[PDB]
């Protein structure tokens, strides 16, 4: 699958790599880093967005001039997706949602959109590399509804395009993550950090920059990545307790844990589940008490011992104890 890169510079901002990528859902957490690392090599990035035109505003700084071109699109409409995908030798999918909106359910936002993006790339032959980003715990048997949709999108993408790599990272940590920041916000607002499982479940936090660099390396491979499913995980197997301890270490506050068994937190997150319908379609999104996340935090999520990892791409993840979590000094 060689032919998707042609270096025409010094590998700087004004250099020219022969990559023209369309990054769907780049206005979120991972997109802000993936687009930045794509633009640094001189790759033109098309950023399709929906809604307000201020959402992709921060991505214009990453390219030199015209390297980043935001374009409006509608997931429901199909000709818009084809229009925003025409000039693209690479397509990267980052579209996904962890809570449920009445406009877009768990299956719609995680599976159907991925199906449409894979199909449109199929008819529009010419995308040399296609990347779809699921979640590490993606499995059909997973109690969480989001993970099952991501898994189904995995088989859908692999069936619609056997050359599509599926990078499958774990919980991300960064300046704008949705795990460490809500914890600090809750601590500064209520004084205690609730534990939906008593700080027992084990998971593998990964730095978002490491995941973006992994996607970049998968793009700039020797052709081994094609039709593979990497499992991007951090170096240390933390837990909900030890990560909260690091967060208290950074935020500089005396620890105060309120243990909460799974049933009580499940019933406390239940009200939003059956109140998605109301006079307004929008409703305040969950912060730490997402029912889907609580169900996902019942089975330990670790990188498979017999699956591809960071070291199979010649990358070493950052140790999530110093620089990765230095953003927490803003609450200090």
């Amino acid at each position: 699958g060689v032919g998707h890169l042609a270096r025409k510079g010094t590998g700087g901002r004004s250099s020219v790599s022969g990559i023209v990528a369309t990054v769907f859902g780049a206005t979120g957490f991972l997109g802000r880093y993936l687009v930045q690392q794509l633009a640094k090599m001189g790759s033109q990035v098309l950023v399709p967005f929906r809604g307000s035109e201020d959402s992709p505003r921060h991505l214009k700084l990453m390219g030199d001039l015209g390297q980043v071109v935001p374009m409006k699109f509608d997931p429901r409409d199909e000709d818009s997706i084809k229009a925003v995908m025409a000039k693209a030798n690479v397509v990267i999918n980052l579209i996904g949602r962890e809570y449920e909106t009445r406009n877009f359910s768990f299956e719609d936002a995680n599976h159907h959109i991925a199906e449409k993006l894979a199909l449109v790339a199929k008819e529009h032959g010419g995308i040399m590399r296609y990347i779809q980003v699921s979640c590490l715990g993606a499995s059909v048997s997973s109690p969480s509804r989001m993970l099952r949709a991501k898994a189904a999108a995995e088989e859908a993408v692999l069936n619609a395009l056997p050359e599509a790599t599926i990078m499958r990272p774990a919980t991300m940590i960064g300046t704008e993550d949705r795990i460490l920041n809500p914890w600090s916000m809750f601590v500064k607002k209520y004084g205690f950090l609730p534990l939906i499982g008593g700080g027992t479940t084990k998971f593998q936090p990964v730095y978002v920059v490491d995941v973006a660099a992994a996607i970049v390396a998968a793009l700039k491979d020797d052709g081994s990545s094609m039709g593979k499913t990497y499992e991007l995980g951090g170096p240390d197997v933390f837990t909900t307790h030890e990560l909260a301890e690091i967060m208290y270490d950074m935020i500089r506050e005396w620890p105060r844990y309120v243990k909460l068994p799974f049933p009580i937190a499940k019933a406390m997150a239940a009200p939003r589940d059956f109140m998605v319908n109301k006079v307004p379609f929008p409703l305040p999104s969950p912060q730490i008490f997402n029912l889907d996340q609580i169900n996902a935090l019942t089975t330990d999520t670790l990188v498979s011992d017999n699956a591809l990892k960071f070291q199979d791409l010649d990358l070493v993840p950052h140790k999530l104890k110093g620089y990765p979590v230095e953003f927490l000094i803003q609450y200090r």
Binding site: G9, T10, G12, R13, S14, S15, R32, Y33, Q36, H58, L61, M62, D64, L65, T175, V209, F327
Partner: protein, 185 residues
Amino acid sequence: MDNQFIFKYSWETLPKKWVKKMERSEHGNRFDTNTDYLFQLLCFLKLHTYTRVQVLIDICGVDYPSRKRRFEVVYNLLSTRYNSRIRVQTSADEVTRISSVVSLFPSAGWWEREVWDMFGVSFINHPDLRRILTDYGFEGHPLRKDFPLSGYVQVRYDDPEKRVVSEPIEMTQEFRYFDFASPWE
């Protein structure tokens, strides 16, 4: 008072071992002296009754890469009492420390700091000799002839790093040098 009078007076009154080059013209009466006699000459020219030069207009450096003593330091002086201007020049290379005149002229401090920033010439007994114009942590002296016009580093905002960062320079359109020199000059 005049270039014809100042030249003849300074020829006689000044010690001969100080000045080694005296041009008298309409562009300006210049005195070229060794760097170890600059302070002595400028103190004499600030206190003598008939050469009351009490204003230091500016201190500039000139870069001559073809000379052994690369840098030329020029002291433009003004005498308000006699309505005359005197220019005093010295020469120094990149690793010689010339004497500072802040003791005589308090205004010499910022000009000497600018000369050190722009050319790399250090001044002995200067109360504080630090860069005054270039950015903090600037490496290199821009006003040298061997320093590239656009420099070596460039500044941009790094969103993942959440700060303004410095990167090696990479121009989208390079500076086009046009050679207009004529062979019949």
